[PDB]
């Protein structure tokens, strides 16, 4: 149990594609294919809280490690399960 | 009319990044916002296959352009739909 709530773990998802496949496709891929995103490698991503949209960054690299600038917020319900001590 | 199954569609999306903020960290998100994503410039892509994991890769840049090379996939149950005629 958790004396401050706000220390809650949310799951939070960093989408940078979307793509409608058909069976075919999805059946013929294997280690080693490369799928096109086609879009920019400044990319645009979506923040997800538990599948759900929250915002949206740009992806940046510093030093070597890749980070997201926040550009947008959406209001959004988030569900949490608390366990009461 | 889909009379050949291989062809249904598959909603796959493509993720980067740790999947944990608490709520501190998520209330405290405003535009210009930075977040690590906890993984090199390359690092870690989930795919989701309707939402459940299908499998890992690696975020590539094809010639100024986002790509994702498979390195593993995972066993999965994915649910379709079909209008029978």
Known sequence: ?????????????????????????????????LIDLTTPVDGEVRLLAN?????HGRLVEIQGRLGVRIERLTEVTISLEVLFQ
């Open 1 to 33: 149990p958790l004396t401050d709530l706000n220390q809650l773990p949310v799951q939070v998802s960093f989408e940078v594609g979307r793509q409608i496949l058909d069976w075919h496709t999805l059946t013929s891929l294997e280690p080693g294919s």
């Open 51 to 55: 599948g759900r949209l929250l915002g």
